[PDB]
Structure formats: C-alpha cells, structure tokens
Amino acid sequence: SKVWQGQAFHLDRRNSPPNSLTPCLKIRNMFDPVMEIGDQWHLAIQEAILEKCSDNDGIVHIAVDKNSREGCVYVKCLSPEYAGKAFKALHGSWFDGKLVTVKYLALTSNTPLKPS
Amino acid sequence: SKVWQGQAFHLDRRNSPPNSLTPCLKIRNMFDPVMEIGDQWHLAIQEAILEKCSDNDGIVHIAVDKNSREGCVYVKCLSPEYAGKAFKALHGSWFDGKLVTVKYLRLDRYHHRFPQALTSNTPLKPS
Amino acid sequence: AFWCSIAYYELNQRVGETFHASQPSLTVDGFTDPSNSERFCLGLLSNVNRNATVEMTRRHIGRGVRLYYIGGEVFAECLSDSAIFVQSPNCNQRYGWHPATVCKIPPGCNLKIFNNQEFAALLAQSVNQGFEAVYQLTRMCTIRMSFVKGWGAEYRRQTVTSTPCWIELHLNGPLQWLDKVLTQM
Amino acid sequence: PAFWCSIAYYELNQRVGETFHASQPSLTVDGFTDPSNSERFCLGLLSNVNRNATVEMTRRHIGRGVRLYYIGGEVFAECLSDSAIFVQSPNCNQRYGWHPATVCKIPPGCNLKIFNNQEFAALLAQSVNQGFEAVYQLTRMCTIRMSFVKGWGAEYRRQTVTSTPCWIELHLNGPLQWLDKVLTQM
Amino acid sequence: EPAFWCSIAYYELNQRVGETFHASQPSLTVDGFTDPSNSERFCLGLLSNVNRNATVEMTRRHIGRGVRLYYIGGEVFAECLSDSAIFVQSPNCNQRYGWHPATVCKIPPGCNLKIFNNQEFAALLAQSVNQGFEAVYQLTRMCTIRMSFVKGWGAEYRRQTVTSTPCWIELHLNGPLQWLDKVLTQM
C-alpha cells in the first residue's frame, strides 16, 4: 500500500526551517530495501515523489539510494524556492506507513521532471 | 558529630508542662554510654549543655550518669525560673542525631543522687 | 522486569490501575480482556465522572495502538480506525523538532517513538549542562499519546489533559539509567 | 482468568484503596483491618483524607460485611453485617424481569443469587445478532455494584450510587473475557 | 507476620500520586529519584501528576535522598537522609513521650527518630480491650504514621493540615493492623 496518508503535523518553526536556503533536499524513510524486489521498484518511489509534488515544475533530478536502509531519496531543484514547495509537500508526510522527513543539503540538469 | 541541630517543635501546651515546677532538670538521650571510652568524655556533654544554655545564668551544677543506658544528664539551677529557661533551650532539641527530652526532677532526689550539688550555688558558663 | 508502565487517563483524571508490560509486544485497545499480559484493555475501566464526549471517544478506540520494543527501539503502530497522537520528546530530539511537538499517526502507520542509545547520548551530554538539565530528562522517559483526538498547535485543545482518552508511557529502562546519574549528581 | 473477580471500593464519588483481586473461590468484604489475607478484603484499614462525618459513621456499621462465593457457575451474596446491603446486579434483575437498575436490599443473614454464568453466556449469544452496540452494553452485566448500610434508588432520597457513603464495584473477569472474545471478532 | 511489614501511599496536597509501595525488606528508603524497579527504594521523582503545581514542583527537587525507614527488633525508625527536614506525625511515638496525639515532630538531616514500638502498641491493645469496642476501634490510627518532606504542618506552621503539605506519605503498619484485626473480630 505505497500511498500517501496525510500529514503528521502542520509545518512551521517547531518542526521545519524558517525559509528555504538550498535547492537540494534529503528525503528519508521512503522505502525499506529489505522488502523490495529487483531494480524496478526505485522508479515507483521516484514516481511517488513526483505525484506528491505534481504542481511543482522545478524538480529536475531525483536519485534514490537503493542501499540506504534509511530510505533515502535525493532531489535537486532549479531554485531554492522550488525546493521549498517540494519541502512542504514531503516533510512530515506519511507514505507506505512510514513518516517522511526532509533535510537540506550528472551535476547539471535543467529539464523539469514530472509524474507519468 | 556532637552538635545541636535545631528543635523538633515549638514548645507549648501539647509537649511541655505549663510552668517550671522544680529548679532541677532531667535530660535524656544526650549520649550513649556503651559507645563512650574512658572518663574524659563527660566534659564534652557538659559543655554542650552550657553552650545551648549560654544565655541562662542559673545553672550551677550538671552531672551526667555514665551508667545511664538512656544517656541521662541532670542539671541543677538556682531558681525554678532559671530551670524553666534552660527547659525551653533543651527540651525537644536535636543533639548528635538524637532527640532530647526533658523532665523536671525533685531537688531532694537530685541531692540524693548527686550530693556534690550541695555546695554549688555559683553559676556555670561555657568555656 | 517490565520494560514499560502505562497509565490511562480521561481528561485530567486517571482511570484504572497501572499496566506493567511484561512482554516485548503490547496493545492498548478498548475491548474487555482482563487477563492478557499483552493487551491493556480499556473497555473494562469504569469512571463515575465520565461524560458523554469521553464515552463516545472510547467507542472509536477499537483495536487501539500496538507498542513493541525491539533492537533497543520502541515503536507505536495505530491499529484503530481513528488516528493516534504521540508526544515523544526523544523522537522530537532525533529530528530537531520542538520537544512538545505532537505527531499524528494515521491508521496503519508506524512511528519510531524511542531509541535507547540516543537517550543515553543525551543523558551524557546533559550531565555537562548541570543538575536541572539531567532531572528534566524525566520527561524524555515519558511518552504520552491520545486516541481519536489530538492536542497541540494544530488542534483546538491545547493540553493533553483536554483530550478525552489518553495514556502516559513510562520507559523503565531509561528511568533506571537516569537514576544512576541523578543519584551521583 | 487467574482471578475470578476484581473489587473496587468507593466513598461517595472517590475511589479508596487498591483494587482487590479474588484468588480463591470464597471471599469476604468486611470493615476490619486484616491487610494480608487473600480471602478477606478489609476496608477498615483504608484511609481517605476527604472522608466526611457521614462516611465515618457508616463504616462503623459494616462489621463482618458481605460474603461473595463463586461455585457451580453461580455467584452469591451473603450479608454478614448487622445492617442491610443493597445489590444492583443486572444479571439478577434481568432474570426476574425487573428494571436493570433495580437495587435489592439484602437483610442481615439473607442470601441473594447475584449472577449465573450460563445465563449470561446465553444472553451473550442471543445479542451477537443484535449488533455491536448491543454486545458492548453487556459490560454492565459483568459489573455488580453494592452499598453498605444505606441504599439508593427511587424509594430513597439518594438517587445514584455516587451518593451512598460506602459502595463497591465487582468485575467478573470470566464473563468479561468471553465478551472480549466476541467483541473483537465483530 | 505478613509478607510486607508496611505499606506506603504518597500524596501531593490532597491527591494521591502513584501506586502503593509495599516494603518487602526490613530497611527502606523513600527518595525523589527515578529508579522504578528497586525493592529497597520508593522513588517519587518518577511519579507523574497532571495537576501538580509549582510549589509541589519546587518541593520535589529538595526531597533528595529522602527518608530511610527500617524495621529491626520490633521497632521501626525514621532517619532523615535528605538535605531538607522531614516532619513525622506518629501517634505511637507521641504516646510514648506523653505529647498530644496530633504532634508533628521535625527530623533534621542526619537525625533519627523511633517512630513506633511493637510492645508499647501491644500493651495499649491489651489496655483498650478492657475499655470497650470503640476504644479498640479508635486504635486503627495508631497503626498509621504520616510524614511530610521539606515542609511541616500543625499549629506552628502556616499549613494547618497534612493535606496542605506539597509532599507527604502515609505508612500502614501491617503487623499491628493484623493484631488489631484479630482482637476486633472476636469482640
């Protein structure tokens, strides 16, 4: 049941940074590699990220750490502001029964990615 | 170790006689004779009584009962009023981690038990 | 002997006896089993001052919350059809949130509410900060959760004592380690 | 179900003392002061800093108290006190067709059948067809409340059990466990 | 004679806090620390109270090592290990010294007080059976000892009742309670 099931809290100072400083995001707790099969599942997590940020037009790079038992996904956007709206849609959200948190952190990509 | 550590309560109706009846006091739980060595230790208890009653000018003889299993010390004052003012400073006080209680004692029994008090009329003071 | 102890509340009044967890897995539900070492059944607890709002809330506790202790970590799993709201200061420390942050666990979701070694690290860091820092760590050994209704900066009720049904978790392991430091301070 | 019953003692609307768990088939709830007998629940030793004068008088009249025995799937109440006891047992009241809230006075020396296991089990099976709420409300059948000395109800000035000075609450752990087995599966 | 020689209930103002502690060993300590599974320490610092106010919060920081209660030779003693004083109300102790039964006695740090003697209670139990039922009934208060940490109560203090002190405990002596029971039942 890899679906989004609401937020854990309302985002503000007591759980989020004041304003976006960087166009790069660290996203953890997106999956459990022990319970994943093959090499195709990583696209589904990439798609899960893009649908949750479907209104965003700034996301230009996603890489998931298949070896990360921490469920890590890395995202680079065009501007820190575009990473800010990807932050607000991802930080503190529930996906596949796990709580997703976000941290700020092929070098140059400029075409936006979108959900299929 | 042998130091005064405050009172257990404020002295009044519920724990003391209404007024002093006799110029002699019986004071218990001032020491434990089983754990004392020699014959000099009694002076430290005598001084402890006089320090706690330094304001009083009526104490003229104090004797400790070395055989007293309850650690009893006897005090003779000049007047019952001076024994009353020694009462309020000693009764219900803590000394050496033990609670000190005081009873009034007849003058004849004091003289019968300590005839050295006969020729004591001069007030004692702490060194 | 018991890795945790649980106390159940209704508004600001405690209800029922204290539950002591003898087994690694435990569930706090609203059903009526009085002699299961793995279930803390709230449906048998009486309260002669219980109001209508509390009575209705207890109908929605259902299968409740599952608490299990594995690998030096404690987890909370919402089995109810309504959400549960966990306030775990050790969890908030790990992610850098306000110590009083309440996080909603939707049905079917799971949350890491405590990690022993992180508490041990904060215990050692707080000895350097003075007595007050170490004694205040008693709040880190306690986790509070409420059924159905939450409290905090998002909800209408401001304090956990305003939630109709809530519990308080005591982690006896961390409390024992905190004691060994507190006595020596 | 290691303990067939659990007893909680009240004074007006405040709980007093720990909960007693019945380890043996026979049990007595008296007003004396034995703190370590697994067969007697002594109420005379339990303190209450909110105790009023009326409660103080009532506790002198508890005396030997009430006898609770569980044999052959049936529970009985025997008044050993010199004052009457007042039992509110929905299983007893349903069996005789009275209002579920009916309180029955037990005079000294008298005995009343307050609970039958198979009768409760039959009503539990009849109610599963009636819905979840019908089965949950059966928790009141697993609870029996009784008061010492003075009673409560439509004939007395006291309307609620929270107004009597001394009363107890009985939990039947057997029936509660079966009710759990049905409630979870619905 | 029973399994636990005493049972202790901890209070905060007029509300009970935490479960009842049952003394399994002859010696016992009631401190304000946070050990939840030591049969020799009754730790009050771990007990929660959602109605706790600031004055109680401040008083709980000064409990410290607390009070030591030990039962030897048919006598139980209270020794103040705290850096603040404790205040004991023991009717059996007040009976022994001829004080008012409600007298509260302050125990300063490092001091020790004999709060109960078995033979004296047994003697008073035998004297009161001759005096009627009510005389034996009123002896239930002799089996109870109440003490408070840091702050005392009575005619000398601003707090008049033990329910006004921020932290206090109540001791039930199960030995005497059993003897009192065996006499009361046969009367």
Numbering used by the authors:
A (entry chain E): 762 to 866, 878 to 888
B (entry chain D): 762 to 888
C (entry chain B): 272 to 456
D (entry chain C): 271 to 456
E (entry chain A): 270 to 456
Paper passage:
Co-crystals of the SMAD2–MAN1 complex were obtained using an MH2 domain of SMAD2, in which the C-terminal phosphorylation region was truncated (residues 262–458, SMAD2C-dC). The final model of the SMAD2–MAN1 complex structure contains three SMAD2 protomers (chains A, B and C) that form a trimeric structure, although we used SMAD2 lacking the C-terminal phosphorylation region that is needed for the trimerization of SMAD2, and two MAN1 molecules (chains D and E) that bind to SMAD2 protomers. The electron density map indicated that each SMAD2 binds one MAN1 at its β-sandwich region. However, due to the poor electron density, we could not build a structure model for one of the three MAN1 molecules. The SMAD2–MAN1 complex structure shows that the SMAD2 MH2 domain binds MAN1 using the hydrophobic surface of the H2 helix, the strands β8 and β9, and the L3 loop. The Trp855, which is stabilized by the intramolecular UHM–ULM interaction of MAN1, is the key residue for the SMAD2–MAN1 interaction. The side chain of Trp855 forms a stacking interaction with the hydrophobic surface of SMAD2 that is composed of Pro377 and Cys380, and with MAN1 Leu860. The side chain of MAN1 Trp855 forms a hydrogen bond with the main chain carbonyl oxygen of SMAD2 Lys375, and Gln766, Ala769 and Gly858 of MAN1 form hydrogen bonds with Cys380, Lys375 and Asn381 of SMAD2, respectively. In this region, the hydrophobic side chain of MAN1 Phe770 stacks with Trp368 and Tyr366 of SMAD2. By contrast, in the SMAD2–MAN1 complex, the second stacking interaction is used for the SMAD2 recognition; Leu860 and Trp855 of MAN1 stack with the hydrophobic surface of Pro377 and Cys380 of SMAD2 to stabilize the SMAD2–MAN1 complex (stack 2).
Receptor-regulated SMAD (R-SMAD: SMAD1, SMAD2, SMAD3, SMAD5 and SMAD8) proteins are key transcription factors of the transforming growth factor-β (TGF-β) superfamily of cytokines. MAN1, an integral protein of the inner nuclear membrane, is a SMAD cofactor that terminates TGF-β superfamily signals. MAN1 interacts with MAD homology 2 (MH2) domains of R-SMAD proteins using its C-terminal U2AF homology motif (UHM) domain and UHM ligand motif (ULM) and facilitates R-SMAD dephosphorylation. The SMAD2–MAN1 and SMAD1–MAN1 complex structures show that an intramolecular UHM–ULM interaction of MAN1 forms a hydrophobic surface that interacts with a hydrophobic surface among the H2 helix, the strands β8 and β9, and the L3 loop of the MH2 domains of R-SMAD proteins.
